Design a protein around this ligand. Structure first.
Ligand SMILES: Nc1ncnc2c1ncn2[C@@H]1O[C@H](COP(=O)(O)OP(=O)(O)NP(=O)(O)O)[C@@H](O)[C@H]1O
Ligand SMILES: Nc1ncnc2c1ncn2[C@@H]1O[C@H](COP(=O)(O)OP(=O)(O)NP(=O)(O)O)[C@@H](O)[C@H]1O
Ligand SMILES: O=C(C[C@H]1NCCC[C@@H]1O)Cn1cnc2cc(Br)c(Cl)cc2c1=O
Ligand SMILES: O=C(C[C@H]1NCCC[C@@H]1O)Cn1cnc2cc(Br)c(Cl)cc2c1=O
Ligand SMILES: [Mg+2]
Ligand SMILES: [Mg+2]
Lengths: 475, 471
């Protein structure tokens, strides 16, 4: 890799994802080919998430990707893509490609939900969405077409709706921490930063490590009764009284893959968490100029077989006329956690020499212990990636109390955690003065609240503070 | 249901799928909301198939749904949907919404595959696809947008390519036979009916049972070196000599769901195969009822634990008989009644959706029996189905025999010379006397007495082929 992650971040990223066989670049601006190597990780977290939501009793469906002008409105225009022709012929009416599916599902919900006996209704779909973005295209993080999951539910009490929102968030925390080994903070968006139609947005926030900029990784809204008013979704309660449902919607995209890449990669290339990577261990024969290659190769496939059995996603790189060192590089680029060398002396000893991707430390593992050790090592490695990552993160958060402390913190590539009065009016103020001195918005009010002494003034107004809140520059 | 499968077939279907909660009708013509009850079945066969391909080494990926006019129009113009405007602004260039993904993938393959060391390449995606259809829209069977799976691969030899084609087909047979309980015949297509760019097209064909009309369930093509020429997909072989890959593609859609409905449903409503249905058994209490509801949960738990997809319909102010109907409509294979007497005996009364035979099952034997019952039922569905199907195929020998069979609502199996020129004739000649095309030459070939004349030309026959009216 030419560019360096701390010198030339933009170009680094571009390089690791292309060299690491994750994406391919494409002739439509904003759209990128997800390749097997990356796609599989999307499969990994998806199954996890999908199981998770099934346990909660959500069921999947599929609405159509095309929407009508008529239905698409309750008085963003640029971001919509419109289909106008079939071959040469116009359509008598232009149809939008969905940016979201709210305006498609809610009309149906009003029809379907008639009585308390229809609730709850918990649907979700795995679809693609299009949003012609004004902002700059970046692979995974912000693209013009993207895969996501998008869930919409409806309930007889807010209570029940809210509980679900929280469950889905915890599921997102896991998506990220347990599988991507990416640390994230649960919080609750500020009024101007939440979802407009929603009563409340809760969210998990990441911090691109070197940059010092926060980023939204997934959302989970309590929609309250608001869309229920709009699309007139009513139900007869136990009593007989017509009433409005309480609703939630939530979502998380292939952006997750992008955060995960940036969270772990280094100048040698990608570094992928073993829980979701495609090949966890790649066995590589080292053979000399002289003969005897066949035995080495043999013991490689034997060891492969033994590991497969033990559960390990193994793979032997046997490519002929292609020197081992070259291979070492190919797979390091691609982020494979363990490399397993086998040369003449490893055969005669009865071992493989095991090189770890994140730290580059080698170790001899006897074939006899491989099927316990290798699993052991990956499981170490996954927690390590999370833990190193979790700390860089923890580091990047300064707990302040006055406005004076902000621009120093900011200029150290840090984010701040400060007492706040939470008046929405202050948000655009704070954005502006910070840019004045690039801007810094509220990122989220975290659930894990450090203690708030009676007295505590808001850092920006002096008014009594309500709650700690994260502020910082963003993406 | 008002309509009847035998009498007003089109209205019936529309009825069963709406009253059965599979789809919902939608203001864009040709596009229907797949509802949970139907969607789950798509999940069922999809996992099957996905696991199947994975065992064959096929990894999934995602290409984009938008294509350049440049790329697309290399090489049914009315079928393409074009995006032209973002908000109000015309894009510099219009972009097509994919109908298939061949023009998006085969370029990348040309780039990616360079050395014998890059083969085989086996990719697949689970995506949606839009084709603006001239022909009339029908739920699942032919729609404008549809979910499908589409697989593309590239190999050093035809040998290896072909093998995979056949593997994928066998997976499709199972897709249909083992999970949907729909019978299908494997076979190879004729030239005018195969895929244009394909060397050979193999296929599983169904027969909508009443209709007398055949239908394509899934395709699996040997592309050969065709597209490799077109897109210059080349590789330096073991010996150092630049060469063209051999390729395959294959695909199967939410149409499968539609055949499945047509193949089992009756005038009471939907009748769904227990291996894929959402709820296999719905317990229903009958009250004149605290104990009753209690036993219903107790039995629900027991069955859940036995592997069975249970659900208890407990809805207050909603009389049992009503419920019986709701669930019959929705296709649930087993209805488990529990009224006062069933509680006092320690049993549930178990009613089959397909036949309506009732049976008493004691709770003590339930966790053995119910699985046993469903597993029976699934086979019974395939077996009636397969029987109707076998019955619809008359093995003829001359043109004389054809119009009778066709008018009998049947399909025919006749020896053929396989000359492509005859296909168009046969279509006309029959459409005259609506038409009849060659559906597929089946893999399982009845024997060919030396001397056998072609039923249409008197030329020597190559092989038995299926012919009949279609969809
Ligand atoms: N274009 C995109 N590409 C990839 N992921 C996206 C994209 N837009 C949004 N997301 C992610 O999906 C989550 C839910 O989307 P949503 O909250 O509806 O977007 P939004 O409100 O438009 N935020 P933003 O797109 O940044 O203006 C966001 O929090 C992002 O993590
Ligand atoms: N519009 C559609 N909606 C749903 N499934 C379809 C549709 N068109 C085709 N399929 C299914 O997908 C399989 C592969 O499609 P394909 O090979 O493109 O056929 P085709 O060229 O579209 N033939 P035809 O459907 O008569 O136009 C078909 O054999 C059908 O089983
Ligand atoms: O998409 C949303 C809110 C929620 N929709 C369901 C998935 C989870 C998500 O938080 C906000 N949003 C974002 N982008 C949009 C782009 C267009 Br174009 C339109 Cl019409 C509408 C929207 C729009 O409503
Ligand atoms: O879709 C095919 C060939 C194969 N593609 C992958 C899935 C399985 C399928 O048999 C044939 N086909 C069908 N319909 C098409 C419609 C349009 Br519009 C275009 Cl451009 C091209 C096509 C086109 O190539
Ligand atoms: Mg946006
Ligand atoms: Mg077609």
């Amino acid at each position: 890799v030419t560019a360096k992650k701390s010198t030339n971040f933009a170009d680094w990223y571009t390089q690791v994802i292309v060299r690491g066989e994750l994406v391919e670049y494409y002739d439509i601006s904003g759209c990128y080919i997800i390749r097997p190597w990356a796609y599989r990780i999307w499969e990994a977290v998806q199954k996890f998430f999908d199981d998770g939501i099934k346990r909660l009793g959500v069921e999947n469906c599929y609405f159509p990707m095309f929407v009508s002008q008529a239905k698409l409105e309750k008085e963003f225009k640029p971001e919509v893509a419109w289909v106008t022709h079939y071959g040469d012929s116009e359509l008598p009416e232009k149809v939008a490609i969905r940016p979201t599916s709210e305006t498609i599902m809610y009309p149906a919900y009003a029809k379907w939900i008639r009585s308390h006996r229809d609730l709850p209704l918990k649907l979700n779909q795995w679809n693609n969405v299009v949003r012609w973005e004004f902002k700059q295209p970046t692979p995974f993080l912000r693209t013009r077409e993207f895969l996501w999951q998008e869930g919409h539910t409806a309930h007889a009490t807010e209570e029940e709706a809210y509980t679900l929102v929280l469950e889905i968030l915890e599921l997102y925390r896991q998506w990220y921490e347990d599988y991507l080994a990416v640390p994230v903070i649960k919080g609750e968006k500020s009024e101007n930063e939440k979802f407009a139609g929603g009563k409340k947005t809760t969210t998990i926030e990441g911090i691109i490590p070197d940059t010092g900029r926060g980023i939204q990784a997934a959302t989970s809204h309590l929609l309250g009764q608001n869309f229920s008013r709009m699309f007139s979704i009513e139900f007869e309660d136990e009593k007989g009284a017509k009433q409005l449902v309480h609703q939630t919607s939530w979502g998380c995209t292939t952006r997750s893959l992008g955060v995960m890449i940036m969270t772990h990669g280094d100048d040698k290339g990608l570094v992928l968490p073993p829980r979701v990577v495609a090949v966890q261990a790649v066995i590589i024969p080292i053979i000399f100029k002289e003969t005897g290659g066949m035995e080495i190769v043999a013991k490689c496939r034997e060891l492969e077989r033994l590991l497969n059995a033990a559960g390990v996603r193994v793979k032997v790189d046997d490519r002929t006329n292609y020197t081992p060192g070259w291979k070492f590089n190919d797979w390091e680029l691609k982020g494979v956690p363990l490399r397993l060398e086998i040369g003449p002396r490893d055969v005669e000893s009865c071992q493989t020499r095991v090189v770890r991707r994140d730290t580059s430390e080698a170790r001899n593992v006897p074939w006899a212990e491989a099927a316990s050790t290798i699993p052991a090592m990956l499981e170490t490695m996954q927690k390590d990636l999370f833990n190193k990552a979790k700390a860089k993160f923890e580091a990047s958060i300064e707990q302040i109390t006055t406005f004076d402390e902000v621009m120093p913190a900011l200029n150290r590539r840090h984010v701040v955690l400060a007492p706040w009065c939470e008046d929405p009016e202050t948000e655009t103020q704070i954005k502006r003065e910070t840019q004045r001195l690039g801007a810094m918005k509220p990122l989220c009010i975290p659930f894990d609240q450090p203690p708030m002494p009676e007295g505590t003034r808001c850092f920006f107004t002096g008014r009594p503070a309500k709650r700690w809140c994260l502020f910082g520059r963003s993406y």
